[PDB]
Amino acid sequence: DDEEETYRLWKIRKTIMQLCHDRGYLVTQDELDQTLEEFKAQSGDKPSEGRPRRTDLTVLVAHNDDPTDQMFVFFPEEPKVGIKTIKVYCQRMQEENITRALIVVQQGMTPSAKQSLVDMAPKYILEQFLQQELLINITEHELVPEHVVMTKEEVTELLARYKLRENQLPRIQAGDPVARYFGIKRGQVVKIIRPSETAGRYITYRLVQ
Amino acid sequence: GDIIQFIYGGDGLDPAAMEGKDEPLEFKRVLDNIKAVFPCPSEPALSKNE
Amino acid sequence: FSIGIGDVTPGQGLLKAKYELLNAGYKKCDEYIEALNTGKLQQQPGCTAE
Amino acid sequence: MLLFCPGCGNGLIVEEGQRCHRFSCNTCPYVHNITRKVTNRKYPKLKEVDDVLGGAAAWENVDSTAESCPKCEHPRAYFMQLQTRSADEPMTTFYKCCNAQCGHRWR
Ligand SMILES: [Zn+2]
């Protein structure tokens, strides 16, 4: 004990940061291969480590298009999050004037918060995850084919090729694990590249709805 | 009018017309048939490069 | 082209092999049931003695 | 174990109302004062403790001796064993092995 806990911390940090890399934010290559002993060097053993503050991270920005667009990652400590803690996060958010942040829960939170997660503000969006999910990166799994989100121009071109109206495309559920991983809202279109049994390849498209 | 697949079965080929195991052709068997039906005694034999 | 009971009657060597085999098989079956009821039987590594 | 009152034949109960605990009836004033200790329970009930410490848990339980496989004998499976049901029945042994693309786990 305190070595399994640190192992979990290491793995969840790896996964969250990989997710942020995949969404296209600033991240440094030397962090990617941060080893568990490297984590032990940067962060001490569990009894000396303050969970709700040690792992918080906000260096990530949307450098791909806007270095001035920053985001947050938070690691609450209480088994179930309460209204006070999300208010503390949101007021910290207002002090830093940022629009997006990530939430991780060890077990869950109050239903009152669940209701609140839909109505913070149109300009403030908060995404909820569970510790027992990000402990593995679903994108690395063998049954998950490569998803690649694509811009408005690419979709324009695609549905110009087949003479489609966008609603004739097959759907991907808004709440699906991979869609929620990539953080794509309604009306976006995703390209799937399926691995054939042979060297060939098949392509298909789905609409987020 | 909504799409189910973009191409039938990923290949577009017809399951009833498969001479192989879900692959339309067996190359060794088609070649040998060509060799046996068209013996061309005049032509010289080919080499790796040719 | 026909079938009769000459095409089904057992020959000479067959009777010997059948008798020999039956004797050996029953003895081995006996050996197993002896092993169980004495409790000396080693249990197979996927189930219990039965 | 159960008790019935000699005077009336109904079941006893356990209670305290004075300096010392008592075995008493609910219909007649017969009672026995427990000064000593009795040593047999009803065998209580709580469900299967499976993932008490699931996954690659602590390393204090490491041990030296281990068995080996009959077929391949690769270097990774140290021993473990388990139990059946309750306080008065046996305990079992399983030899599970796992590299990839198979299904082995010997009893
Ligand atoms: Zn009574």
Curated annotation (Swiss-Prot), chain A:
The location annotated for the cross-link Glycyl lysine isopeptide (Lys-Gly) (interchain with G-Cter in SUMO2) is: K80
A biological process (GO) of this protein is: tRNA transcription by RNA polymerase III
Q: Which GO terms describe its molecular function?
A: DNA binding; DNA-directed RNA polymerase activity
User: Localized where?
Assistant: Nucleus; Nucleus, Nucleolus
Q: Mind telling me which Gene3D superfamilies this protein's record contains?
A: RNA polymerase, Rpb5, N-terminal domain, RPB5-like RNA polymerase subunit
Which keywords accompany this UniProt record?
A: Acetylation, DNA-directed RNA polymerase, Host-virus interaction, Isopeptide bond, Nucleus, Transcription, Ubl conjugation
Pfam families the UniProt entry points to:
RNA_pol_Rpb5_C (PF01191), RNA_pol_Rpb5_N (PF03871)
Main localisation: nucleus
- Cellular component, GO annotation: cytosol; nucleoplasm; nucleus; RNA polymerase I complex; RNA polymerase II, core complex; RNA polymerase III complex; RPAP3/R2TP/prefoldin-like complex
- Record-linked InterPro entries: Arch_Rpo5/euc_Rpb5, RNA_pol_Rpb5_N, RNA_pol_Rpb5_N_sf, RNA_pol_subH/Rpb5_C, RNA_pol_subH/Rpb5_CS, RPB5-like_sf
- The answer on whether this UniProt entry bears the keyword Hydrolase reads no
- HAMAP family assigned to the protein according to its UniProt record, in alphabetical order: RNApol_Rpo5_RPB5
Q: Read off the PANTHER family from this record.
A: DNA-DIRECTED RNA POLYMERASES I, II, AND III SUBUNIT RPABC1
Family classification: Belongs to the archaeal Rpo5/eukaryotic RPB5 RNA polymerase subunit family.
| Subunit organization | Component of the RNA polymerase I (Pol I), RNA polymerase II (Pol II) and RNA polymerase III (Pol III) complexes consisting of at least 13, 12 and 17 subunits, respectively. Pol I complex consists of a ten-subunit catalytic core composed of POLR1A/RPA1, POLR1B/RPA2, POLR1C/RPAC1, POLR1D/RPAC2, POLR1H/RPA12, POLR2E/RPABC1, POLR2F/RPABC2, POLR2H/RPABC3, POLR2K/RPABC4 and POLR2L/RPABC5; a mobile stalk subunit POLR1F/RPA43 protruding from the core and additional subunits homologous to general transcription factors POLR1E/RPA49 and POLR1G/RPA34. (Microbial infection) Interacts with HBV protein X.
The protein's name is DNA-directed RNA polymerases I, II, and III subunit RPABC1
UniProt lineage? Eukaryota, Metazoa, Chordata, Craniata, Vertebrata
From Swiss-Prot, chain C:
Q: Report where it is expressed, by tissue.
A: Expressed in the brain, in the cortex and the white matter (at protein level).
The organism's place on the tree of life at top rank? Eukaryota
Record's subcellular location = Nucleus; Cytoplasm, Cytosol
- Please describe the quaternary structure of this protein: Component of the RNA polymerase III (Pol III) (Pol III) complex consisting of 17 subunits: a ten-subunit catalytic core composed of POLR3A/RPC1, POLR3B/RPC2, POLR1C/RPAC1, POLR1D/RPAC2, POLR3K/RPC10, POLR2E/RPABC1, POLR2F/RPABC2, POLR2H/RPABC3, POLR2K/RPABC4 and POLR2L/RPABC5; a mobile stalk composed of two subunits POLR3H/RPC8 and CRCP/RPC9, protruding from the core and functioning primarily in transcription initiation; and additional subunits homologous to general transcription factors of the RNA polymerase II machinery, POLR3C/RPC3-POLR3F/RPC6-POLR3G/RPC7 heterotrimer required for transcription initiation and POLR3D/RPC4-POLR3E/RPC5 heterodimer involved in both transcription initiation and termination.
Disease linked to the protein: Leukodystrophy, hypomyelinating, 7, with or without oligodontia and/or hypogonadotropic hypogonadism: An autosomal recessive neurodegenerative disorder characterized by childhood onset of progressive motor decline manifest as spasticity, ataxia, tremor, and cerebellar signs, as well as mild cognitive regression. Other features may include hypodontia or oligodontia and hypogonadotropic hypogonadism. There is considerable inter- and intrafamilial variability.
Q: What is this protein called?
A: DNA-directed RNA polymerase III subunit RPC1
Q: Which organism is it from?
A: Homo sapiens
- Upper lineage: Eukaryota, Metazoa, Chordata, Craniata, Vertebrata
Gene of this entry = POLR3A
Swiss-Prot record, chain D:
Look up the record and give one Gene Ontology term from the biological process aspect. innate immune response
Q: Does the keyword Metal-binding apply?
A: yes
Hairpin (motif): residue ranges: 88-89
Q: Any notes on this protein's domains?
A: The TFIIS-type zinc-binding beta-ribbon domain contains an acidic hairpin motif (residues Asp-88, Glu-89) that likely coordinates the nucleophilic water and magnesium to cleave the scissile phosphodiester bond and release the mis-incorporated 5'-ribonucleotides.
**Record family assignment:** Belongs to the archaeal RpoM/eukaryotic RPA12/RPB9/RPC11 RNA polymerase family.
User: Positions of the zinc fingers (C4-type)?
Assistant: 5-28
Q: List the disulfide bonds.
A: none
Organism, as annotated: Homo sapiens
InterPro entries documented for this protein: DNA-dir_RNA_pol-M_15_CS, Rpa12/Rpb9/Rpc10/TFS, Zn_ribbon_RPB9, Zn_ribbon_RPC11_C, Znf_TFIIS
Per UniProt, the TFIIS-type Zn-finger stretches lie at: 65-107
Q: Where does Zn(2+) 1 bind?
A: C5, C8, C25, C28
Per UniProt, Zn(2+) 2 binds at C69, C72, C98, C102
Q: Which gene encodes it?
A: POLR3K
Q: Which GO terms describe its cellular component?
A: cytosol; nucleoplasm; RNA polymerase III complex
User: Does the entry feature the keyword Zinc-finger, yes or no?
Assistant: yes
- Report the function annotation for this chain: Core component of RNA polymerase III (Pol III) which synthesizes small non-coding RNAs using the four ribonucleoside triphosphates as substrates. Can mediate Pol I proofreading of the nascent RNA transcript. Anchors into the Pol III active site to constantly monitor transcription fidelity, cleaves mis-incorporated 5'-ribonucleotides and restarts the transcription process. Once Pol III reaches the poly(dT) termination signal, can induce Pol III clamp opening and transcription termination.
What is the annotated localization of this protein? Nucleus
Q: What is its main location?
A: nucleus
Task: Report the protein name in the record.
Answer: DNA-directed RNA polymerase III subunit RPC10
Under PANTHER family, the record lists: DNA-DIRECTED RNA POLYMERASE, DNA-DIRECTED RNA POLYMERASE III SUBUNIT RPC10
